[PDB]
Motif scaffolding. Structure first.
Motif, PDB file in Angstrom:
ATOM      1  N   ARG A  27       0.871  -1.171   0.000  1.00 48.05           N
ATOM      2  CA  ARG A  27       0.000   0.000   0.000  1.00 48.05           C
ATOM      3  C   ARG A  27       0.906   1.218   0.000  1.00 48.05           C
ATOM      4  O   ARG A  27       2.050   1.148   0.460  1.00 48.05           O
ATOM      5  N   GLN A  28       0.376   2.346  -0.450  1.00 49.08           N
ATOM      6  CA  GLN A  28       1.103   3.591  -0.539  1.00 49.08           C
ATOM      7  C   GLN A  28       0.213   4.758  -0.130  1.00 49.08           C
ATOM      8  O   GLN A  28      -0.980   4.598   0.142  1.00 49.08           O
ATOM      9  N   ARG A  29       0.824   5.935  -0.063  1.00 46.55           N
ATOM     10  CA  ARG A  29       0.231   7.215   0.287  1.00 46.55           C
ATOM     11  C   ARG A  29       1.002   8.299  -0.463  1.00 46.55           C
ATOM     12  O   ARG A  29       1.921   7.992  -1.227  1.00 46.55           O
ATOM     13  N   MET A  30       0.661   9.563  -0.242  1.00 44.69           N
ATOM     14  CA  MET A  30       1.308  10.705  -0.881  1.00 44.69           C
ATOM     15  C   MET A  30       1.534  11.814   0.144  1.00 44.69           C
ATOM     16  O   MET A  30       0.898  11.835   1.208  1.00 44.69           O
ATOM     17  N   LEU A  31       2.484  12.710  -0.130  1.00 42.85           N
ATOM     18  CA  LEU A  31       2.772  13.830   0.755  1.00 42.85           C
ATOM     19  C   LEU A  31       1.712  14.908   0.515  1.00 42.85           C
ATOM     20  O   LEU A  31       1.170  15.017  -0.585  1.00 42.85           O
ATOM     21  N   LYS A  32       1.385  15.693   1.546  1.00 36.22           N
ATOM     22  CA  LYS A  32       0.379  16.760   1.455  1.00 36.22           C
ATOM     23  C   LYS A  32       0.919  18.066   2.043  1.00 36.22           C
ATOM     24  O   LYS A  32       0.144  18.932   2.471  1.00 36.22           O
ATOM     25  N   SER A  33       2.237  18.188   2.112  1.00 38.73           N
ATOM     26  CA  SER A  33       3.024  19.293   2.621  1.00 38.73           C
ATOM     27  C   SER A  33       3.012  20.500   1.674  1.00 38.73           C
ATOM     28  O   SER A  33       4.064  20.963   1.219  1.00 38.73           O
ATOM     29  N   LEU A  34       1.823  21.022   1.353  1.00 41.62           N
ATOM     30  CA  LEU A  34       1.665  22.163   0.464  1.00 41.62           C
ATOM     31  C   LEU A  34       2.368  23.397   1.039  1.00 41.62           C
ATOM     32  O   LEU A  34       2.877  24.221   0.284  1.00 41.62           O
ATOM     33  N   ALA A  35       2.432  23.521   2.373  1.00 40.92           N
ATOM     34  CA  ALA A  35       3.069  24.639   3.054  1.00 40.92           C
ATOM     35  C   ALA A  35       4.600  24.594   2.936  1.00 40.92           C
ATOM     36  O   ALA A  35       5.264  25.454   3.515  1.00 40.92           O
ATOM     37  N   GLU A  36       5.165  23.610   2.226  1.00 39.22           N
ATOM     38  CA  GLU A  36       6.599  23.433   2.003  1.00 39.22           C
ATOM     39  C   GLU A  36       7.377  23.452   3.319  1.00 39.22           C
ATOM     40  O   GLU A  36       8.356  24.172   3.508  1.00 39.22           O
ATOM     41  N   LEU A  37       6.921  22.604   4.240  1.00 38.80           N
ATOM     42  CA  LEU A  37       7.491  22.422   5.572  1.00 38.80           C
ATOM     43  C   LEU A  37       8.968  22.024   5.541  1.00 38.80           C
ATOM     44  O   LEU A  37       9.667  22.240   6.532  1.00 38.80           O
ATOM     45  N   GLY A  38       9.425  21.416   4.444  1.00 42.57           N
ATOM     46  CA  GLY A  38      10.758  20.961   4.208  1.00 42.57           C
ATOM     47  C   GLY A  38      10.652  19.849   3.178  1.00 42.57           C
ATOM     48  O   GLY A  38       9.986  20.002   2.147  1.00 42.57           O
ATOM     49  N   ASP A  39      11.302  18.737   3.476  1.00 46.16           N
ATOM     50  CA  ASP A  39      11.401  17.529   2.666  1.00 46.16           C
ATOM     51  C   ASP A  39      11.982  16.440   3.569  1.00 46.16           C
ATOM     52  O   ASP A  39      13.131  16.567   3.995  1.00 46.16           O
ATOM     53  N   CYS A  40      11.198  15.420   3.934  1.00 39.92           N
ATOM     54  CA  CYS A  40      11.656  14.339   4.807  1.00 39.92           C
ATOM     55  C   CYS A  40      11.893  13.029   4.060  1.00 39.92           C
ATOM     56  O   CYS A  40      11.172  12.699   3.119  1.00 39.92           O
ATOM     57  N   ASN A  41      12.815  12.209   4.570  1.00 38.59           N
ATOM     58  CA  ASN A  41      13.142  10.898   3.992  1.00 38.59           C
ATOM     59  C   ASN A  41      12.080   9.848   4.357  1.00 38.59           C
ATOM     60  O   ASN A  41      12.305   8.657   4.154  1.00 38.59           O
ATOM     61  N   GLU A  42      10.962  10.247   4.964  1.00 40.30           N
ATOM     62  CA  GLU A  42       9.884   9.362   5.382  1.00 40.30           C
ATOM     63  C   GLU A  42       9.321   8.561   4.203  1.00 40.30           C
ATOM     64  O   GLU A  42       9.418   8.955   3.035  1.00 40.30           O
ATOM     65  N   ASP A  43       8.690   7.452   4.565  1.00 38.51           N
ATOM     66  CA  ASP A  43       8.109   6.459   3.669  1.00 38.51           C
ATOM     67  C   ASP A  43       6.744   6.820   3.092  1.00 38.51           C
ATOM     68  O   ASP A  43       5.845   7.284   3.806  1.00 38.51           O
ATOM     69  N   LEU A  44       6.557   6.487   1.814  1.00 39.50           N
ATOM     70  CA  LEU A  44       5.341   6.687   1.036  1.00 39.50           C
ATOM     71  C   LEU A  44       4.760   5.343   0.594  1.00 39.50           C
ATOM     72  O   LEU A  44       3.606   5.316   0.174  1.00 39.50           O
ATOM     73  N   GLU A  45       5.503   4.237   0.692  1.00 38.31           N
ATOM     74  CA  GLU A  45       5.072   2.891   0.323  1.00 38.31           C
ATOM     75  C   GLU A  45       5.509   1.934   1.430  1.00 38.31           C
ATOM     76  O   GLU A  45       6.555   2.142   2.047  1.00 38.31           O
ATOM     77  N   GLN A  46       4.712   0.897   1.684  1.00 34.26           N
ATOM     78  CA  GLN A  46       4.971  -0.124   2.684  1.00 34.26           C
ATOM     79  C   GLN A  46       4.412  -1.458   2.194  1.00 34.26           C
ATOM     80  O   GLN A  46       3.405  -1.516   1.484  1.00 34.26           O
ATOM     81  N   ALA A  47       5.047  -2.531   2.652  1.00 35.78           N
ATOM     82  CA  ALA A  47       4.720  -3.921   2.345  1.00 35.78           C
ATOM     83  C   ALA A  47       4.342  -4.678   3.623  1.00 35.78           C
ATOM     84  O   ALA A  47       4.771  -4.298   4.718  1.00 35.78           O
ATOM     85  N   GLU A  48       3.574  -5.761   3.491  1.00 39.08           N
ATOM     86  CA  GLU A  48       3.103  -6.612   4.584  1.00 39.08           C
ATOM     87  C   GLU A  48       3.017  -8.062   4.093  1.00 39.08           C
ATOM     88  O   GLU A  48       2.886  -8.316   2.895  1.00 39.08           O
TER      89      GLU A  48
END
Length: 56
Positions: A27-48
């Motif tokens: 499963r995956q998701r998307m970033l919603k940081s429209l305020a340009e908070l920065g840029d993180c190395n956090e995950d957008l996709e995960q497996a199970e």
């Protein structure tokens, strides 16, 4: 409030990568940081792990 990077919640899991026996799902998701908070190395996709029953 210094919060972590603005990311959408993980959407519901789709059907498993197999119909029967050993298998996994993803499963995956998307970033919603429209305020340009920065840029993180956090995950957008995960497996199970998800094994289905014997093959019909």
């Amino acid at each position: 409030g210094s919060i972590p990077c603005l990311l959408s919640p993980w959407s519901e899991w789709s059907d498993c990568s197999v119909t029967c026996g050993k298998g996994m799902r993803t499963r995956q998701r998307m970033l919603k940081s429209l305020a340009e908070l920065g840029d993180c190395n956090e995950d957008l996709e995960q497996a199970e792990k998800c094994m289905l029953p014997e093959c019909p």
